[PDB]
């Protein structure tokens, strides 16, 4: 049951300054941060990151927004951590967003919505194995 | 004036689940993190990072602690931020840390204080470059 999804907290995260009250949203929920590095993406990689919307129309802005500044890649475990990541995100659209959920508190529009999550256990692999080696990666008990 | 310091959440700060809150801590008294790395530290390395320490009777102890979990290695930037990441951290002794201090708040002994802070700038410099490499440090503007 216990899974490892992708979590990226994109610039305008940083710069509200809420990168611990992210953070604490996994934890509280059990979404334990096993991997953790603040990088400033190249258009490079944030392309081949989301290749799957490069037929998109917005994708060259998610790209400079991407890249705009620094954020902070996590690969957060636990037990259906895929899904449970999805929820505690909330919807794409901040104004769509459930009460109590990261977009709904911090983002600010549709386009500078504050957090990524893998979509699928599938995704998830590589997107984690895109960031991170494996060696990179450690859990830990909480206690 | 502003200055850049490194902070490691020791692995018992990790366990206790509260990355996020030490965090906020720094974020919200306006030291900003411009490196984060999560990382299980070697003996080697953690001998070499305290070798300032290594005549010091507590030695042998504190390097088995940093190397039994993995830690989060930060560099936070901001106003007088060597003296201000070691205030808001607390005493050695959590029994003498300051009310709201983050040992005070979550340390349990001496020998297990959740957090290290560099003691001086000079020391900074040496500290910050031991773990990270330039490019792996980046500033971005606030709110
Ligand atoms: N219909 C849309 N119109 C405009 N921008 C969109 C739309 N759908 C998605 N996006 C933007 O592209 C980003 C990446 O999409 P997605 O692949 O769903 O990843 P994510 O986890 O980052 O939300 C979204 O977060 C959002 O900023
Ligand atoms: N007298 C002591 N007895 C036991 N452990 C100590 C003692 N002094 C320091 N240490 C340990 O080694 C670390 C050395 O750091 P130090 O430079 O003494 O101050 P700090 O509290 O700012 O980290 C401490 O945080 C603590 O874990
Ligand atoms: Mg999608
Ligand atoms: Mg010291």
Known sequence: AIERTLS?????GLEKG????????????????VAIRLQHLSQ?????????????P??????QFMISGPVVLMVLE??????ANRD??????????????????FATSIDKNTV?????????????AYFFRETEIH???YQ
Request: charged letters at 30%.
């Open 18 to 33: 809420v990168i611990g009250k992210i953070i604490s949203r996994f934890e509280e929920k059990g979404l334990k941060p």
């Open 78 to 83: 636990g037990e259906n951590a895929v899904l």
């Open 116 to 128: 990524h999550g893998s979509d699928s256990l599938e995704n998830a692999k590589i997107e984690i």
């Open 8 to 12: 990226i907290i994109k610039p305008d």
């Open 139 to 141: 859990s830990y008990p």
């Open 58 to 63: 917005f994708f060259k802005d998610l790209v």
């Open 44 to 56: 490079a990689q944030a392309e081949g990151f989301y290749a799957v919307h490069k037929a998109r």
């Open 88 to 105: 505690i995100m909330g919807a794409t659209n901040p104004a769509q967003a459930a009460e109590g959920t990261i977009r709904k508190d």
